Amino acid sequence: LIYGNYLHLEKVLNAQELQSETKGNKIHDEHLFIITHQAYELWFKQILWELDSVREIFQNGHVRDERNMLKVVSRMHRVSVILKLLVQQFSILETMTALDFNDFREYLSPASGFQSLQFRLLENKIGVLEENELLLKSEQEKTLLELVEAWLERTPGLEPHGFNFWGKLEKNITRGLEEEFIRIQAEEKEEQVAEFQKQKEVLLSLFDEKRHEHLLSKGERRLSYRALQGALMIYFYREEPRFQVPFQLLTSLMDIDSLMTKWRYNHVCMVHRMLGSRYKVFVDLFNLSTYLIPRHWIPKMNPTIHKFLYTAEY
Amino acid sequence: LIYGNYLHLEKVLNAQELQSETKGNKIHDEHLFIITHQAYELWFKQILWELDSVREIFQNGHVRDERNMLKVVSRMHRVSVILKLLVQQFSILETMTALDFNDFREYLFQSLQFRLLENKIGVLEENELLLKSEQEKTLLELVEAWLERTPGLEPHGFNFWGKLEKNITRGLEEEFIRIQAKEESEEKEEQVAEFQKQKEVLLSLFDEKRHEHLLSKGERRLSYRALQGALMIYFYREEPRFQVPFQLLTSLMDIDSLMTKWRYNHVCMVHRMLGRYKVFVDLFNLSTYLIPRHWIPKMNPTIHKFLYTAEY
Amino acid sequence: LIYGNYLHLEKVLNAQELQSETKGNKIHDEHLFIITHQAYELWFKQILWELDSVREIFQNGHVRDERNMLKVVSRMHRVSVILKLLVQQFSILETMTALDFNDFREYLSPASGFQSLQFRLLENKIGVLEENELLLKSEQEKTLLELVEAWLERTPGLEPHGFNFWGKLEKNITRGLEEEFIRIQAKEESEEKEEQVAEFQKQKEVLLSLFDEKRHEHLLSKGERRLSYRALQGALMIYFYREEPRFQVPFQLLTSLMDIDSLMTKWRYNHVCMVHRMLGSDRYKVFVDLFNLSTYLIPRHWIPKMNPTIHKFLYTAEY
Amino acid sequence: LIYGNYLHLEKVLNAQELQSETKGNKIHDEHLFIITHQAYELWFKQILWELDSVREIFQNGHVRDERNMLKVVSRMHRVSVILKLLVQQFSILETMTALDFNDFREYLSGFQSLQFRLLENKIGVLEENELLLKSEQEKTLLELVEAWLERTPGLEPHGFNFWGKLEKNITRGLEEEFIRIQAKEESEEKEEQVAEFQKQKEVLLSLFDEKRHEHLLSKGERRLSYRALQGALMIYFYREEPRFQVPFQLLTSLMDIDSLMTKWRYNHVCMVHRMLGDRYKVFVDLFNLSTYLIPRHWIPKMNPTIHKFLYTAEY
Ligand SMILES: CCOC(=O)c1c(OC)nc2n(c1=O)CCC[C@H]2N(C(=O)Nc1ccccc1C(C)C)[C@@H](C)c1ccccc1
Ligand SMILES: CCOC(=O)c1c(OC)nc2n(c1=O)CCC[C@H]2N(C(=O)Nc1ccccc1C(C)C)[C@@H](C)c1ccccc1
Ligand SMILES: CCOC(=O)c1c(OC)nc2n(c1=O)CCC[C@H]2N(C(=O)Nc1ccccc1C(C)C)[C@@H](C)c1ccccc1
Ligand SMILES: CCOC(=O)c1c(OC)nc2n(c1=O)CCC[C@H]2N(C(=O)Nc1ccccc1C(C)C)[C@@H](C)c1ccccc1
Ligand SMILES: C[C@](N)(Cc1c[nH]c2ccccc12)C(=O)O
Ligand SMILES: C[C@](N)(Cc1c[nH]c2ccccc12)C(=O)O
Ligand SMILES: C[C@](N)(Cc1c[nH]c2ccccc12)C(=O)O
Ligand SMILES: C[C@](N)(Cc1c[nH]c2ccccc12)C(=O)O
């Protein structure tokens, strides 16, 4: 095979038509503007390729066979590696001064008229709240959030008739807080009762299903109450073999959120720089990470009974 | 204008034909392999765009009007910023394990744009483009000609090389006297060797015949007069006329460091999947010349107006 | 000299006292937390070293000798290189999970009680709106913004008796806009003509606002402007004539100043995210005027032309 | 607690004594030189902190309880993340021109980093001297990883017998290839594929020559033992099987650390030459096993009804 024919460089390297050169006088920096956007769109296509493949593994049921956890986590890690390079790619646009941009700015019609289809498809496919047919599919089809929520709802250890994680956790937090109240009641004392009455209210709020449902309606929550429990199960028992790679998956999901927001931040700054001057899908994963529960209150697991913690399924 | 029509996304986003999917069974990682190479080639086209424009400014004589120094230095800096991102772009190929590569390896070269870039900088139908890059004036040759016209070299005027030679000679004689006076010791017996080595190196700078010999052996690239112009820019870099030209010599060295770092990363990735060439060596060499700042010939503002007066 | 003695490694490498190990049981990740903060503080000390030296060059008058422009621009570039590494340094804290942080979180007393003195000194020295004595000096002494403002007020070409840049610019913008109004009113009464009069009446109001000194003074009181009206003109002079030899390196300095603002804000953004991640969840731009002047839609053909036979200042440097 | 007291900023921020300012006239860039080296040394201390903790987990036997695999892999990943930042930290020294360095070069006389040497020794690269003697004598990360690879499940000849099954499959697969090639008509493609086969066969069959591996280990060309080599290759081919997913990430981390240490060494040599005018790869065996052209259909198949070790963890 010929290198250029394999990469279809006759299409890729023949798609740089300068609008300044077309509509009048050529402006040198417009070529940088065109290539940078083409480079972003090539990487958006790759991020969609990796995202749809991971979505397929969940949707078609392959994620149930736990041999595919390495491939899901690996591909989610690749998405964040690509996103890290896209955040670094802003440094190239920084080399184009605002004064030079205003030279070719006239040939770019209204700026509030350009919108990336692939970026919108990517946001929709993750779960952010002819070309229109593709957009209608991205909004209708199962998002990476919905597919991760369904999988979190099936987390081992949640079943009330088995391990009953939420029941044990609630009882342990209640019994642990009673010991704390006793220890405190036995200026420093008057201040520690306020620090306790605040920690108690926060910890017990986790067991209020009606408050979670209210927050889901207000847009402050995305995951269902059962998916929230499955994620918290993976968090506290992350060292247990069955939850080690699933813990890396929850981490990757949060990383992709941090990087998409960091990219969005960089983008807004570049837009405000050239034209003159919430989005976290996995907020629940960030929120569960910020729960002050002592490791000694986490329900202890018996290896003689709870074989699920160290036995994998296909 | 429509965004996708402006970027010609109908060509760009419809050029990913997987050879595994075509010749049999689709291998997922092959899409990453295709996009990464297409991304490199888009940036190679940009580096050639910036390089040819800078080359044009020198070749057509616009570089003589010093208003274009900001544009040359700015564009050379941009090339290094793109090269920095291309070195980082190797991390994406690293996400493809060697074992996954062997799955699509059965269905699988030389980059024309990379070769055109190397040729255009001065590294020692598609073939017509290659023949032009080898024949046309390189960025090194164009920079050499411009360095040959550096103000202050003229023997009838500032005579930089004459003043510098006398100052280095008189300064080294003081050093020999200062060392031979020190008491016979281990420090004195060692500093005579450190002096006889520094003297041989410093005085070699004024041997034009040795420079010409080294140019033939490939050890030097710039002419003896271009070498003097570059060293003039180095020592008088704080003088207004040489501030932006100093940044240009720095950018040229940066591009060499980054091309070599890219080449290093490339070789490692090739050896990972399938189991010197510094154009501006003279700019690196002149940066490593141990000359005390008090030996640099001083310049009088009443006589040497060239140091603070620009030309168009 | 001995390597460790030169770097004072007996002080540097003997300053890692884990509070978890001290007050109870050792938590491994607390060492990463301590070293990362010590690394940030070493770079903050370096940024203050470079910043104070640049501030000294302006304040002591050395910036008047234009041989020091390469050294000012070089050091401002270094500050942004250090800041870029500090933004990348957040990736190391990302390696510490929130769950691991909660293990040593108890030994760190109230978080709303820790404050970096050096970060505050750095913000004050740039111009962001015994240890307290150092802070009092940073707030009282001349900021990098005030020192850059004074230098911008002396930009060649502003003098009304000489080049008179603001006068020429105002006349050219006024005469150019009148031709635009005539060109638009000549076009046949259509949807394109009725829409271009709105695009013109908006561009005219924006362009002519640049010559309203009373509006600039009003915006300076509201905090929307930082530079004086004359410093604003000096910066715009450097912008339009940036290719002229005398303004090439000063243009790079205005660019560095804006870069430092973008990077300080990008660092602040990264910091807030890391704080919200571990403890549960244009104002700070000193050089806003430099960003604003970059966004002024003036056609290059309206920029007052310069005669080399008369305007020798554009290509002749001063000491 | 006070922020500066917690970080001991009275030691950290009061350790910058410029030798140019001390021995005569202050050279501004010397402060950058001192802080950059102090920043490297702070990160070297952190890399040693993470490395010793991982080494302890192996040496004291905690690595046998597989609940600690997340903590080993996580910490090895952290070392690479710090090393990535140290490679980026060279860009700061690049802001100091060679000409500016020669201004303070006279006050610097030869120096050697003890922590860098301790780090190289602790990974397994082939009063302060007491610390160096301990790093050379104590078990390296390579030796501790080798011992753990020697106990990889599936190697046991009485059980799964990975090496036996693999050898038979490679032998039978190569015979099919020889037959398939010799059948092809005498052509330029046929005359070239016999050379490509005789080279691939010699390479693949060399993997089962224990005497050649022992000889290469003595010549320094190999680091891991023959059994550790088999355990690593077992983790490679069965990386998708639950028990080998996290151990595969560990072998990847170990190779990453080698790639990054080499990239750091490259950057260092360039910066040294700029201011003053497979050998070091500890895990060469992990890189070598990654470059073994074996078709996935020749990998011995595993039965879940019999081979419960692939999906059952141990404590
Ligand atoms: C949040 C997803 O962003 C979009 O869908 C989007 C968009 O799509 C191509 N184009 C733009 N905006 C957008 O919100 C804001 C006005 C500016 C415009 N541009 C961008 O930002 N390009 C841009 C810049 C940096 C990084 C990435 C992009 C694109 C790919 C989003 C270019 C097209 C432009 C700049 C200046 C004048 C005229 C056009
Ligand atoms: C010094 C200029 O390099 C070349 O001209 C060149 C080249 O051009 C496209 N392609 C290759 N080599 C080369 O020397 C060496 C063998 C490997 C091959 N590949 C590369 O390296 N791609 C590559 C990798 C990383 C970064 C950049 C490239 C290309 C763009 C040079 C891809 C095509 C490949 C990989 C594996 C199997 C088959 C093909
Ligand atoms: C805008 C300037 O920032 C400060 O002056 C400042 C500060 O100074 C040391 N320390 C903190 N905050 C601050 O606003 C917010 C609460 C958290 C706290 N921490 C930080 O952010 N460290 C931090 C993190 C990343 C990067 C840099 C820093 C410091 C050097 C600012 C550490 C001390 C911490 C974390 C968690 C619990 C307890 C303490
Ligand atoms: C392979 C492990 O390297 C060393 O142990 C080592 C060393 O230790 C501190 N110092 C040096 N060399 C070394 O081989 C080579 C000569 C140069 C010297 N320097 C360095 O490289 N610093 C350096 C530079 C960049 C990154 C890291 C370092 C140190 C921390 C290794 C500084 C001390 C220096 C520069 C110029 C003149 C005098 C001294
Ligand atoms: C067999 C299973 N993979 C079980 C499962 C569901 N959610 C999980 C989270 C972590 C670990 C396992 C699970 C499945 O039902 O998909
Ligand atoms: C007028 C001029 N630009 C002079 C020139 C040549 N080489 C230089 C190096 C540095 C500074 C100036 C020059 C020219 O002849 O091109
Ligand atoms: C001699 C001078 N450096 C002139 C000056 C002031 N501001 C400037 C801006 C750009 C260029 C020059 C200046 C001085 O008075 O400081
Ligand atoms: C119980 C065990 N961790 C078994 C073991 C050894 N090496 C391994 C490699 C991959 C997976 C498991 C192992 C041990 O003996 O340490």
Numbering used by the authors:
A (entry chain A): 40 to 168, 187 to 243, 248 to 338, 358 to 394
B (entry chain D): 40 to 147, 153 to 168, 187 to 337, 358 to 394
C (entry chain B): 40 to 168, 187 to 338, 357 to 394
D (entry chain C): 40 to 148, 152 to 168, 187 to 337, 357 to 394
What did the authors write?
Tryptophan-2,3-dioxygenase (TDO2) and indoleamine-2,3-dioxygenase (IDO1) are structurally distinct heme enzymes that catalyze the conversion of L-tryptophan to N-formyl-kynurenine, and play important roles in metabolism, inflammation, and tumor immune surveillance. Tryptophan-2,3-dioxygenase (TDO2) and indoleamine-2,3-dioxygenase 1 (IDO1) catalyze the same reaction: the conversion of L-tryptophan (Trp) to N-formyl-kynurenine (NFK). Both enzymes evolved to bind heme for substrate binding and catalysis but are structurally distinct: IDO1 is monomeric, while TDO2 is tetrameric with two independent TDO2 molecules contributing to each of its four active sites. While apo-TDO2 is catalytically inactive, the term “apo-TDO2 inhibitor” is used to describe compounds that bind to apo-TDO2, compete with heme binding and thus prevent the formation of enzymatically active holo-TDO2.
Cpd-2 is a mixture of two diastereomers, of which only ethyl (R)-9-(3-(2-isopropylphenyl)-1-((S)-1-phenylethyl)ureido)-2-methoxy-4-oxo-6,7,8,9-tetrahydro-4H-pyrido[1,2-a]pyrimidine-3-carboxylate was observed in the co-crystal structure. The benzyl rings are bridged by a central urea linker that forms hydrogen bonds with the side chains of His328 and His76 (both are key residues for holo-TDO2 activity, with His328 anchoring the heme via its iron atom and His76 binding the substrate Trp). The larger fused ring substituent of the inhibitor binds between loop 145–155 and His328 and may serve to stabilize the loop conformation and shield the hydrogen bond between the inhibitor and His328 from competing water molecules. Residues Phe72, His76 and His328 are shifted away from the inhibitor by 1.0-1.5 Å, together with the neighboring residues of the associated alpha-helices. The shortest distance between the His76 and His328 side chain atoms is 4.0 Å in apo-TDO2 and 6.9 Å in the Cpd-2 / apo-TDO2 complex. AMT was also observed in the structure of Cpd-2 bound to apo-TDO2, with an identical binding mode.
